[PDB]
Design a protein around this ligand. Sequence first.
Ligand SMILES: [Cl-]
Ligand SMILES: [Cl-]
Ligand SMILES: [Cl-]
Ligand SMILES: [Cl-]
Ligand SMILES: [Cl-]
Ligand SMILES: [Cl-]
Ligand SMILES: [Cl-]
Ligand code: NA
Ligand code: NA
Ligand code: NA
Ligand code: NA
Ligand code: NA
Ligand code: NA
Lengths: 311, 311, 311, 311, 311
Amino acid sequence: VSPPPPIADEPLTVNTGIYLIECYSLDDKAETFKVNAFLSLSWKDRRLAFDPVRSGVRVKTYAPEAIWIPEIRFVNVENARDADVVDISVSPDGTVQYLERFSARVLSPLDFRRYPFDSQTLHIYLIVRSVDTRNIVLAVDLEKVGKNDDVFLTGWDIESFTAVVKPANFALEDRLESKLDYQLRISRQYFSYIPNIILPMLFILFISWTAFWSTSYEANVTLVVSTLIAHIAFNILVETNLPKTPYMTYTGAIIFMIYLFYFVAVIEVTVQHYLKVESQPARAASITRASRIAFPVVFLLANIILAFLFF
Amino acid sequence: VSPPPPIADEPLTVNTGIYLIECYSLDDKAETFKVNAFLSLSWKDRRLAFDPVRSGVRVKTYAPEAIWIPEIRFVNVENARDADVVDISVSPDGTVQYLERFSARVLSPLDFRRYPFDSQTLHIYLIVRSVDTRNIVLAVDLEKVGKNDDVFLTGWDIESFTAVVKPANFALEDRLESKLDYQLRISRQYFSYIPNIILPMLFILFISWTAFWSTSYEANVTLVVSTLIAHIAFNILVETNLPKTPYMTYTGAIIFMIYLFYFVAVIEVTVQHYLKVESQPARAASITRASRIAFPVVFLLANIILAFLFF
Amino acid sequence: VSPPPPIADEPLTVNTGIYLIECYSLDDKAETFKVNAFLSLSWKDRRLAFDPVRSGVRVKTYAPEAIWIPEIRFVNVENARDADVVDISVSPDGTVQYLERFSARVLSPLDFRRYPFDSQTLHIYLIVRSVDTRNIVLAVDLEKVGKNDDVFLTGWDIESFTAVVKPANFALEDRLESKLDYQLRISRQYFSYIPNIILPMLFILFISWTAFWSTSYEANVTLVVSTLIAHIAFNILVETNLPKTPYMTYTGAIIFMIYLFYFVAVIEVTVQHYLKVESQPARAASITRASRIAFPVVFLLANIILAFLFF
Amino acid sequence: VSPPPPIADEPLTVNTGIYLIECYSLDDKAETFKVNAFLSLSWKDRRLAFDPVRSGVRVKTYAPEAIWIPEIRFVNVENARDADVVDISVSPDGTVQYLERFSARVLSPLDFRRYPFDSQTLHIYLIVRSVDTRNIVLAVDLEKVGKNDDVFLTGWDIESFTAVVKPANFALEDRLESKLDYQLRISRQYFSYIPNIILPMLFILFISWTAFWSTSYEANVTLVVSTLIAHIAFNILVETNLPKTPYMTYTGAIIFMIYLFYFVAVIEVTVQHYLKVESQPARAASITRASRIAFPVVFLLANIILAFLFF
Amino acid sequence: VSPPPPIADEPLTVNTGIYLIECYSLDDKAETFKVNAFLSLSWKDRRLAFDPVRSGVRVKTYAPEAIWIPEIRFVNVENARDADVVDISVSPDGTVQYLERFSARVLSPLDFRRYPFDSQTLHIYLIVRSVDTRNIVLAVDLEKVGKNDDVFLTGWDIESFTAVVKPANFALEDRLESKLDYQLRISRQYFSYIPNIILPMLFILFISWTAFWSTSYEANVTLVVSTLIAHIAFNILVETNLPKTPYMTYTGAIIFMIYLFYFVAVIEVTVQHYLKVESQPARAASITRASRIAFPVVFLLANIILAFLFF
Ligand SMILES: [Cl-]
Ligand SMILES: [Cl-]
Ligand SMILES: [Cl-]
Ligand SMILES: [Cl-]
Ligand SMILES: [Cl-]
Ligand SMILES: [Cl-]
Ligand SMILES: [Cl-]
Ligand code: NA
Ligand code: NA
Ligand code: NA
Ligand code: NA
Ligand code: NA
Ligand code: NA
């Protein structure tokens, strides 16, 4: 089969629409998500036109094999989409109405800078390669772009599913390609991070600061070192749920900065002891008393500065 | 092939039934379960009707290709179901009896609020898209709905497998859709959680409270900090078996609240020592004596309040 | 094609046989195992009978397509078996001899009560659905049931591979189903558990009891708390290799009971210190001296009681 | 199609050859390895004979479907090999030269007794089932057996890839089976084990022995218990990279024996303290002084004995 | 179908080109990466030639089945590539322009010597086996070799994608083979390693050195042993993200060497205590004072030596 012939030299417009059914498995480490939706395509093929009076019927159904169907592919998919044809319907003028149900693992990158208080724009790129007979251009039928109300992405809030109506028309391997951008705007449900990582991490830090109300070196060493290891466990736990970024993430920055607080606490604890042993507990008392105010104040200000830089 | 013709303007009723053979792999993190079942379909096609005297036979068997079969899909499945046709049998009046054995990974969300003392309703949604010739409506043939006696879902108790007999008939992409709700009611086997997580977690908490019968700061610091680290390991272990929820789970709440008890124990231990050093062991004795009653009482009441809010 | 016709009203007997070539991947958590075997089927179809004198051949080979083959399925399989036909041979009387090679992930439940000193009976269920023309019944040709000598299941000892010769006939969706039970009897190789989990776990417990020969509270607290944490690690390591059971496993019971020994050791250590501080070291000495005998004796008797209840 | 006809009662010889391209994914836990190779087959089928003077073409090419091809299977594979036909060349006498390139997950058992200083022989078993027309026997055309130079198996050294030229001809389910043995000899690259597990494990053990130059019970308890916990982590780490064996592995034995050294160190530390408290530091001094020589000497001799038994 | 006939004895040149659409999943442990590209093939088949005047058309499209297509395979792929034909276009002279979109898991080895400051050259090898009619040789059509701007390999910087224009022409199983080398040059984004592994690891080491400003053996033992355990946790975390190499990696060397610093710190701490107890605190003071300079200086020089050997 060959593509439909042009009336004049116009390109063939394939109207598209994606309707999300099931949306799942957003892998932060892999920067992938799995989709399960409807793909609706529509184009005019005059060769398929018929008289509704003479034929009796208002629409004609065809098998994919019977007629010409545009080879529509997804750009950022991992493997080729799994698709199953729901319907192919021709109206008297030759307007073909294709519908298929598909599933694909889509590879759209993520910006972890404000993690876990981040929002993402997932992309689904539809593309079409022009044949030698004629150039094929994509379009968005906005009435055929939507999503189910049940559509739920675990640990995420789905904000919008829209399409950038003007396609990107460009050359690739000496043939004209028409790309379309479907954007799924989502925002992370940060709630669980608070009682599971953030608050536990702050509690262990404040426990390390009880060393500023203790003269026992052996007890302080235990307090600051033990809590530093729990902080190491939280750093490891966090960096497992995330990929290696060439930039600093919000949680990454807080986690990193807290190491400096542990390091300075070890110095204070060491200084206090050296001074006490050197028979200068008065000077050690001044340093310990100051640290009680300095550590919370510097922690609170440093956090104001970080939240400011990141948001 | 085309769909059966209407005697009048009535829609075509496809009677359905799901009989679960094997139910398995309930992933709490993914909110998926795998199923292995029979899917039975029954509809009347007058074109297939025959005389049982003239033809000799009582029923006629057909290959799927020979006749029209309604396109039945599952809504909340992950990928398209794996199905294999068991039988197609036509009765003299034209009543078709389709049977297929399928497997699918079903995506039904879970409510972890009362975890691990939760009960779930897993859903299997059957759907059908109306063709242009005529509208297709689903029905439940209750005699062809069930579960095998052997059906076991590891770590769960299977309560019931029923179907909401009235379909959800609605419009989608300008065509009628008939959705059916098959509900699998299950309840978690919480027993293992008690000797593996709950009791070990309570033992480590009570061990931290032996610091209220000790004047040794060095020993108390070790007792409360060491047991706090074991509590962190239990928090990590628990949050691995579960997905990130935008709400508080029952175990999540208890685990979180227990951090506050560790934090207040560190404060008491610190106050006792400061007072002893400040040569006020009488006042430190009053606080330590009070804590011995306060901590268990507040723990017991806080737990009564939590169990009340959650159940 | 249609099934063979009955000489009288008798059902059609399909003689079966499974011969294991490779047996592997027993997942304790999933209660699955992978199998790679031959499935052999034999039934009489009089329509296929021929005179060996007139025809020239002793046996005739047919492609699956050509003749009627009974639809045999596995009940407890996860997904449909992967099968490849080795041979189809018809003798002069019409006796068909089918052979295929297959692989399947079989879902047979396990009894972890005596873990890791448990024995299991894995099941492979063959089933057949009767058609409208005639009822189909399964049989066991014992000369065609066996296993290769090389057959090895990693971490397990293969005891026997037999079949329950009388099928389990029952009605399902108003049609006769003939089920067959192939049983693979295996027993766990517990050897590794001894130097990796059991002996390390006992060593850490005995180390906690060296606190009964020490008056140093700070040292005892460290001994009992540190070893309790290593016991938590062993509990976590063990519960990862196993699924969540609604019953107590043997290792689960020992692991649980050992927590009580750690809890009572913390109490003794606390009592000894309180008494020493209260200037009653004579009474604390009596308790410590008693504990030295009590703890090993109660541990040894409690273990005799457990081994008795479980074996 | 039928198998080629004989000249006499001679069996049909299918000449074989395996040429490894890619060798990878050696799973120690699963005792599997993945292989991407060429499987070459050759047999004579006089029925395919042609005159090139008349046919124009020295050799004739065919699609697998067009002619009879022996059903050659692998014994020890997990699932059926993924194969793609490269070439089928038929010369005028009727000699078929079959080429395919496949990938398979071969299941060949491993001997971990000398781990990580072990050498393995991985097996790839080719098999063929005789048909009723005539018996089929396998052969090795040594000119078509080899491996690529680039063939690298991560963490292993590939020594040789050879075939046992004489097939194993045996009876199975009353039909001749001709099995061939292809052997891939490999030896583990033990180097990473030395700086990652062996030396770290020895360092922590020697650190525990610094307790023989310390009179501080509190410090000794910390030294021996802390280092014992690091040894538990190394035991856990090692047993994760390995399956549960019914025998003792070399690393398993060293790891196990080291527990006894920790247990005896705890006894010495306890004895020293009891004696010091009992006002017998002279006797405690004798035991501590002896331990300084005993522990390294017994460790060194025990290791000589183990290396001797294992190698 | 047969291959195109030669004008003379020249081989058939198949011009190739790979253009990467998406590049993903670089597994350091497995030494694999997944690719999704275009594969373009061009060769002349005079049998397909046509006059543009007489035929009207400028180019003729064909289905893969209609015409002869060279069997191009990838050497270092894991399983056979997933490919889907985009276009086949024949010019009047008989020049075929084939295009297919494919996905494959490519197995190219990695050099972890400078990890995580390493650069890699990933390879994609295209190969072709000569048929008996004529020899087939590969070529690089540089205008049809490239990558998309969006191409992102998580945690890596993509430097270049080029092809070694001269193929490797060699004999294999008595037929010629034409191999082509496509090289993807990438360099690791080491930035995340600094705040997550390197700086945390240095902080814990410096904390261990605060023992040189403390006379408390009990506190020093805790400082050096606790920080040694956190270093073990970093060694384990690092060796999980990497495969077992027969050479020393840069991070591996630093991690290893740091163990020696912990071991010498334990010795110093032990010597200081022995001397203090032996009533020689003056000599212990000299050693402790020296260690304060020795440890940082030796650490800094040893690191200069390592960076020199590795870079
Ligand atoms: Cl696609
Ligand atoms: Cl479906
Ligand atoms: Cl099956
Ligand atoms: Cl019954
Ligand atoms: Cl029946
Ligand atoms: Cl095979
Ligand atoms: Cl390939
Ligand atoms: Na078409
Ligand atoms: Na149909
Ligand atoms: Na059949
Ligand atoms: Na064939
Ligand atoms: Na072709
Ligand atoms: Na301590």
